Amino acid sequence: PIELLPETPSQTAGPYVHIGLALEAAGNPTRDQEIWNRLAKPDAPGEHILLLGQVYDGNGHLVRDSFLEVWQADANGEYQDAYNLENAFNSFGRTATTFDAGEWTLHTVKPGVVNNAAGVPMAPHINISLFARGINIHLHTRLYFDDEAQANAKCPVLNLIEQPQRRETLIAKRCEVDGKTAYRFDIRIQGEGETVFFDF
Amino acid sequence: PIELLPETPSQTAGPYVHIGLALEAAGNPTRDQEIWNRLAKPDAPGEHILLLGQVYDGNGHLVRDSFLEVWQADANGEYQDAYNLENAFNSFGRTATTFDAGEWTLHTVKPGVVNNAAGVPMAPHINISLFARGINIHLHTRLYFDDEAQANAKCPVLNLIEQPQRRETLIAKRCEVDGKTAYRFDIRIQGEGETVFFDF
Amino acid sequence: PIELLPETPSQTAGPYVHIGLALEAAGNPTRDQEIWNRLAKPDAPGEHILLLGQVYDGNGHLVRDSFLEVWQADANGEYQDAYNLENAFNSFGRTATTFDAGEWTLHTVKPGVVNNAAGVPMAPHINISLFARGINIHLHTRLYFDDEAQANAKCPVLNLIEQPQRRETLIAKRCEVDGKTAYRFDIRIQGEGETVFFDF
Amino acid sequence: PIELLPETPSQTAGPYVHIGLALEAAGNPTRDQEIWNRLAKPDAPGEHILLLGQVYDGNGHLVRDSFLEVWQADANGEYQDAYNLENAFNSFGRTATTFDAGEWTLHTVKPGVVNNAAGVPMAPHINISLFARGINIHLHTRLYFDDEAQANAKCPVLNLIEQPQRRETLIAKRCEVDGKTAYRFDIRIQGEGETVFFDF
Amino acid sequence: PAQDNSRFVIRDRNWHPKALTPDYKTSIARSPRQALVSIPQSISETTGPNFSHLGFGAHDHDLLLNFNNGGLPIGERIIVAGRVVDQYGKPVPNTLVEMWQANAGGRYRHKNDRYLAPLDPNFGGVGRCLTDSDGYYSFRTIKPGPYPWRNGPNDWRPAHIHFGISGPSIATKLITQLYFEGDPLIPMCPIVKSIANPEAVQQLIAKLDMNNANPMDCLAYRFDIVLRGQRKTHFEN
Amino acid sequence: PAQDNSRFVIRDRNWHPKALTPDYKTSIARSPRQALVSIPQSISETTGPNFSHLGFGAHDHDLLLNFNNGGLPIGERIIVAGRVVDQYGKPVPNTLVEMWQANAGGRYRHKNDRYLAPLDPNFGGVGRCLTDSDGYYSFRTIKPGPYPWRNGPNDWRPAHIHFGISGPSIATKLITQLYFEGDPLIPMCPIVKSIANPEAVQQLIAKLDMNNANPMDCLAYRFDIVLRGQRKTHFEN
Amino acid sequence: PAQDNSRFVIRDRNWHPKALTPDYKTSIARSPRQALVSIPQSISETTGPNFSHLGFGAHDHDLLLNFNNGGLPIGERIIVAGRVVDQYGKPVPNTLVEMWQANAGGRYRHKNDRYLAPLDPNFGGVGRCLTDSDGYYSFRTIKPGPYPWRNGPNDWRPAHIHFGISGPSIATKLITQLYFEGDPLIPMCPIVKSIANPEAVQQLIAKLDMNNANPMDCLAYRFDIVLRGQRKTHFE
Ligand SMILES: Oc1ccc(F)cc1O
Ligand SMILES: Oc1ccc(F)cc1O
Ligand SMILES: Oc1ccc(F)cc1O
Ligand SMILES: Oc1ccc(F)cc1O
Ligand SMILES: Oc1ccc(F)cc1O
Ligand SMILES: Oc1ccc(F)cc1O
Ligand SMILES: Oc1ccc(F)cc1O
Ligand SMILES: Oc1ccc(F)cc1O
Ligand SMILES: Oc1ccc(F)cc1O
Ligand SMILES: Oc1ccc(F)cc1O
Ligand SMILES: Oc1ccc(F)cc1O
Ligand SMILES: Oc1ccc(F)cc1O
Ligand SMILES: Oc1ccc(F)cc1O
Ligand SMILES: Oc1ccc(F)cc1O
Ligand SMILES: Oc1ccc(F)cc1O
Ligand SMILES: Oc1ccc(F)cc1O
Ligand SMILES: Oc1ccc(F)cc1O
Ligand SMILES: [Cl-]
Ligand SMILES: [Fe+3]
Ligand SMILES: [Fe+3]
Ligand SMILES: [Fe+3]
Ligand SMILES: [Fe+3]
C-alpha cells in the first residue's frame, strides 16, 4: 500500500511541562505575552461562564501536574483562529491544575452550536486536550453542559458513544462560584467513571 | 518434539453472527429446518424447565449480540447426538440474546447425572459455549442447578475450581417464568463475579 | 494459488512412431491383436462410409509419416468405450499416412448426433488427434460432413470458430470411392487453408 | 547512462473500448458532449470530404472492433488544438468500425500543407492512430491523397519509406459516397499489402 | 446415544488468538481477567451433535440461488471448497460447515448493519453443508467486499467469509474467518492481528484454485480446515 | 493554433509490450510483420488536442452517480486517483484521462459482452476527467470483478480498469490498464504478460491508499501515470 | 470564520507510544482502560489557533540571551533548527514551536525539581518561535544534561529538549522530545521505550549538523518534525 512520511511520535509532556507552557505555575517569570486561561474579556458577547475541574488517576488520586488545552466556538458558533491578546474573545486557551488543590479554571463564554461535516447540529461543547507526566500521547475529550439536555440527546458525537452511562462522563455540572455561573467538569483517566476519550 | 498439523485458528463470531446461525434474530427469513432453542418436545421424558439469562461485559453492560451453544444429557443421563428436529429430545441447541433486553432463553429438561472418565458422578449440568463480537475464541462454561446442592458439593469438575466463591458463579438460580419452573444463569465475562470459564 | 502435480510434458511421436503404434507400416510383423482403421464390421448398424485424406505441411508438401487417432459416436449417437476386436463397432481407431501416396483411410459408420454439456445438439463429427515427426504436442480437430449443412450451421462447437471461412476447413467432402460412399478430409497444418485445431 | 522514469506501458484497448471512447457504438447512452467523427461544421473553410475505410487482419478478415484517432491540419495548414464542439473545425477526431460492415467514416476538410522540422513541405496528410482488441500498442500511420501525386512524390516523410511499393499503402483512393467527394483508406495490419506503420 | 470413545489434542492458546487484544477495541471489555480452569475430558466434552439427519434444502450451499428474488446476485462468482481434517490428517466426514458473509459491496443483510452500501435483492449471505464421506465441502457464492467498521477512525475489514465447523465433539467446534489470497487489507486488520503468530494467520488465507473453476462461469478458492486431533484413549484408569 | 515547440523522448518498445505475443491469441493476426518505419518529429507529431474547453458533466468522474437509475451500484466503493507526470517528473496539467470498466461481477455494459453475470442497473462503467493544474486526477467507482474470456480454455482477466490519457501531443497518447495490488490473477494473464519485463508490469499495479479513503464510506487506490518526457528542441538545423 | 476545509490523515497509534507502558511507572495509573471512541472529523477538530499575531520578544528563540542576569549560560552552545512538514512533505508555515529543557547539568528551573545539580543564573530553559514561510524554525541554546529520576532505582533521562508544535489544527497538535545523536542513554530510557517501534524512536534523534554550525562559536543539531498529513475533502 501507499505509505506517507511517518508522523513524529508523541512523548509525555513530563512533570516540568509548565516551564515551557505555563510559566507562572513553574515559579518562573513570564514573558510579555502568554497564552492562558481567560478566553473572554468582560465585553465579549455571550453568557460568561467559569469552568473548573479536577483530574483523577486510576487510584482516585488527584493529578496535580495536568495541563489542558481547550478549543471552543464563540457564542455565535464560530471558531476564531486568529489568536491575539487584544481580542475580546479567543477560541483557544490553556490551563493547568494547581499543585496544592489540583483544580484548573477557565474563564470563557458558553459556546454556540456548530454543525458536524454532514450538517447535523452538535450540542454546545468545548474540545479538551489533556497532557501530563505519565500521559504518553495526549487525551482528547469534550465538555458538554447539563443544561443542554435536549441538544445533548441529539448530538451526533455523543451518540457515537455506545453506552448512555459513558455519555454522562462528558456532561459538566452547573453550579455557582462566588456569585457567577459555573460548570464543574472532572476528568477520571482510569477506572470507575472513566471519562470518554476520543480518537479522530 | 512431535508436532501435528496446527489447528485452524479461531476468530470472533462478529456482530452479524445471527445471519449465519440465528437467522430469525438477524431480521431475516428462515430455512425449512433450523437449529434453535427448544431441545424438548412437550412429551419428552423428564422435568421440563426454562433456562434464561443475560450476559455482561467488564463494565457491567449487557452483551446484546451474544450467541450460545448448549450440550446436555437427557433426563436419563444420555447424550442424544443424532440431531433431528423430529426427536423428542435433542441434547444440542442454540440461543441468542435479544437485542432489546439482552436475554436468551432455552426450553429443555433437567439433565440426568453422567459420570466422568474415572467413573465419578458429575452434578447435573448444561455445557455452554459463548460466542460474540469481541470474543476471539469462544468461552466454555457449565450451568449447574441451585436445587442440586448435595450433588454440586461432590462434583469432580466443580471441585477443580480452587475457590468456593468462584464455584458459586456456575450455579443457576431457580425461579418461575410465567408460572413455570425456570433457572436463571447470568454470565459475567469480566470483573466482579466473573463466571468461571474452562479449558479442555 | 493452488498448484497440482504438473502433467508429464508431451514430446513428438517422431519419424518411427509406427514401430510402436502402427506395426505393419514400419515393415514389421504384427501381434495377434492390433488397434487399427476398421471401426465397423459389415454388420454394424448405420451408414457405412469410407473416410480418407492427406496431411499437408506449411510449404504445401505431404506429411507422409502422420499418425491419426479417431474417436466417434456409433450410428445412434453413443460412444462405445469397451474396445474389443470382437465388437461389431468400436468408437476408437488409428490410421496412418502411407509413405508413397500420403493417404490415410478409415472404415466406419456415420456417427449420430450427440449433445454438448448444455444439452445442445452437436453436428455429426469425428474427433481426430494428429501426431507426427515435428509435431511436439498432438493437434486436435474434428471432421464434420458436407451433407449435414443444416446441423453444421447450428453446431455449438463450429459456432465457436469466429470466422465462417475457418469453419469450412472442418467439413469433409462427400464422394464415391470404387462404388462406396466416402468423404475426403484433408488437413493443412499451416498456412493457406490452415485447419482449425482445438484446445480443451 | 542517464535513465529517466519509465513510461507507463501500453496495453490493448480491448473489445469493449467503445464503452469508454465510442459510447453510442457500445449500445449505450451518450453524454452531453462527445469527441467523435465530424471534424468540420458545414461552413468550415476548405474542401469538405468524407474519409472511410475498413481494417483487415493477417487472414484478410475485417477487424470489426477497431477504434481510430485522427489529427490533421485545417485547410490553411494550421493545427487547431483547442478542442471544442463549437469550433468550426477540430483538428482532432475519433471514429470506430461498424460491427456489421466493419467500416469507419470521418467528415472533415482536406488538410493544408505543413512543413517538417527542417522547413520541407509535407504532402497533405491525416495522422492516424489505430487501436483494437489484439493490438497491444497502438499503430501509427498517415493517410495521404491520390490526387496529390506531385506533392506525395516530394514528401520527406513518404521518402523515408525505402520501397515505393510500400509508399502506395498510405495513399487513399478518391471516390464518391452519396455523390460527395470521398477518399477510401483501407488498413491491412499484416501480410500482403501490409500498411506502413510509423515510430516516432 | 453418544459414548466417550476418544480424546482431543489440547488446544494451543498461543496459536489461537488470546482473549485480550486491545487494538480490537471490543475485546477489552469482553475478555476474562481470570485464568481459564483446566478440566479433564469427560463424555460431556468428547461428544457432540452429528447433523447427518438435519434436513438441508437443495440450495443451502449455493448462495447464488438460495435468496432468489428474480435474478442473480451482482458480484464475483466463486466456488469456496476444501477439506475438513483433524490434526492427525484424518478426514472429518459428515460434519456441519456453516458460513455467512456480506454482499459484493461489503453490506450485510442484518438489521444492525449501518453501512450505507446497498443490499443486493438477490443475495442473502448464508450457506450450510455437510462434509462428504472424504471430508470435502463446497459452497458457491459471490466474493464479499471489504467494509468499514467503528474500531479506529479508518479501519476496514478485509474481504472475509465467516465459518463455523462442528466436528465430532463440542471440544472441536470452531468459528473462524476465511480471507482471500493477496488482499492488502489483511496485514492491517486488528481482528486478523488478534492472532499473534503470522504463520497462524496464513492458515486463514484461501488460495485461488484455478483447477476448480468453471470456465466462462466462476472462479474458485480453496480453504482447508484443521480441527483438533482425535485419538483413542489409552492406559486410562 | 498549435506550434512545434518540443520533442518527446523516444519510446522503449521493449518496455512496452511487443505487437506479436502469441499467448494472447488475438495478437497473432493483428500484429504487423514488417518493421515500424522511424520518422523524425514534426509539428504533426509534437502537437495534439487539448481538452480544457470540452464540456464535462458534474458527475463525469463519478461512476457511483453518473448512471443513476434509482439507486447506488452494488460493489466495493473506491476512489481511484493519481498524478500524470512525464519521464522528467514534470506534472502534466489539464490533460484528458478516460476510463472504462466492468461492474462488480465482471460484466461490461456493452452489447458484445456474452458473459452471463448480470448487469447492475445503477452502473455504466465510464468516466472522464481533466488533470488539475498540478497533474492530479480522481475518479470514484466500484472495484471491477475479474472475468472469463475465450483465450485459453480457463483464462480470466484480473480485475482491471482501462485508461486512456491524451497528454500534450499525439506522440504521448496512451491506452493502458490498471490492475489491483495483490490480485493473484495478475501473473497468470496473457494480456498482462504481453509486457515482457516484470518491472514494467509493476507500473500498472495500483496500490491501496488508506490516506485517501473516506472512512465508513470508500477505500482508495493510487495509480500514477508516466508519459513520454517532453523537452525543448536544441541545436536543430 | 475558521472553516472546515481539510482532513487530517488518521494517526498510527502503534507508531506513537501506547498509553499503558508499565516500565514507565507513572503511565500505569494515568492510562485509560477503556478504548478510545473514534469520531469523524468536524470543524471542531479540523481547525485550531493560528499564532501569527502572538507578540514574540526579540530573544524568545534564543535561550543564551532570554534569561540574562549578568552573563552567558555555562554549557555547550548549540543551534537547534529544522523544518516542520506534514506527512505529504508539505511545509507547515507560521506554526508555533515551543521548547523547554534543563540546564547543562540536568537541572530544571522549576520549583518541583529536587535534583541537587545547581541552577545556572543565566539560563531559564524556555523558548518559542513561529516557523517561517518555508516551514523552518531555529533556536539557540545550551545542550541539556541528562538527569536522574525516580522511576527504577538508577534511571537517567538522556539529554533532551521538550517540544510542542501547534500545526494547522487541534488534530495536528503534538508534544514530543528531541534526543541527541549518539547518546548511550537513549536505548536505556523507559520513556523513549514507550515507543514500541525502534524506527519511530529514530525520528526523535537530532543529528549533528556541522553545516549549520558557527565556527569558533556554536555547534548545531537538526530536528525535522512531521505532523499529520492534510488533504482536501473529496466525494463527501
Ligand atoms: O444520550 C445521552 C447524552 C448525554 C447523557 F448524559 C446521557 C445520554 O443518554
Ligand atoms: O463446592 C461448592 C459447589 C458449588 C458452590 F456454589 C459452592 C461450593 O463450595
Ligand atoms: O456456420 C458454418 C458452419 C460450417 C461452414 F462450413 C460454414 C459456416 O458458416
Ligand atoms: O514516392 C512515392 C510516393 C507515393 C507512392 F504511392 C509511390 C511513390 O513512389
Ligand atoms: O488478568 C489478565 C491481565 C492481562 C492479561 F493479558 C490476561 C489476564 O487474564
Ligand atoms: O485430573 C485433571 C485435572 C485437571 C486437568 F486439566 C486434567 C486432569 O487430568
Ligand atoms: O485423559 C485425557 C487424555 C488426553 C487429553 F487431551 C485429555 C484427557 O482428559
Ligand atoms: O455515506 C455513504 C456511505 C456508503 C454508501 F454506500 C452511501 C453513503 O451515502
Ligand atoms: O499478529 C500478526 C498477524 C499477522 C500480521 F500480518 C501481523 C501481525 O502482527
Ligand atoms: O515479421 C516478424 C516476425 C516475428 C516477429 F517477432 C516480428 C516480426 O515483425
Ligand atoms: O532524419 C531522420 C530520419 C529518420 C528518423 F527516425 C529520424 C531522423 O532524424
Ligand atoms: O529532432 C528530434 C529530437 C529528439 C527526438 F526524440 C526526435 C526528434 O525528431
Ligand atoms: O453460465 C453462466 C455463467 C455466468 C452467469 F452469471 C450465469 C450463468 O448461467
Ligand atoms: O512477462 C511477464 C510479466 C509479468 C509476469 F508476472 C510474468 C511475465 O512473464
Ligand atoms: O483495558 C486495557 C487493558 C490492557 C491494555 F493494554 C489496554 C487496555 O485498555
Ligand atoms: O461515521 C463515523 C463514525 C465513527 C468514525 F470514527 C468515523 C465515521 O465516519
Ligand atoms: O471525512 C473524513 C475523511 C478523512 C478522515 F481522515 C477523517 C474524516 O472524518
Ligand atoms: Cl539562579
Ligand atoms: Fe524532561
Ligand atoms: Fe464480518
Ligand atoms: Fe526416437
Ligand atoms: Fe477489459
Short mmCIF file of C-alpha atoms in Angstrom, two decimals, chain D residues 4 9 25 27 41 46 49-50 63 75 79 85 100 103-104 107 117-118 135 138 145 147 165 175 193:
data_model
loop_
_atom_site.label_atom_id
_atom_site.label_comp_id
_atom_site.label_asym_id
_atom_site.label_seq_id
_atom_site.Cartn_x
_atom_site.Cartn_y
_atom_site.Cartn_z
CA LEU D 4 14.54 8.74 -16.82
CA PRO D 9 3.45 0.54 -20.53
CA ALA D 25 -21.29 2.23 -30.66
CA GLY D 27 -25.09 0.39 -27.48
CA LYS D 41 -19.06 22.32 -39.25
CA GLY D 46 -11.77 24.36 -47.23
CA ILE D 49 -14.57 15.49 -47.78
CA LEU D 50 -15.64 12.13 -46.39
CA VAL D 63 -11.39 -6.05 -37.73
CA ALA D 75 -7.49 23.80 -44.77
CA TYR D 79 -3.34 22.58 -36.29
CA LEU D 85 -17.62 21.12 -30.06
CA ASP D 100 -21.80 -5.23 -39.31
CA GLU D 103 -16.40 0.43 -41.91
CA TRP D 104 -15.34 3.69 -40.23
CA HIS D 107 -16.29 14.02 -42.01
CA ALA D 117 11.12 20.44 -38.75
CA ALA D 118 13.73 21.22 -41.44
CA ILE D 135 -3.25 -4.58 -30.67
CA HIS D 138 -1.45 1.44 -30.98
CA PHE D 145 -4.36 11.56 -51.08
CA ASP D 147 -4.90 13.43 -56.21
CA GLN D 165 5.52 -0.28 -53.31
CA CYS D 175 -14.17 8.08 -54.79
CA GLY D 193 -0.30 -5.09 -48.79
#
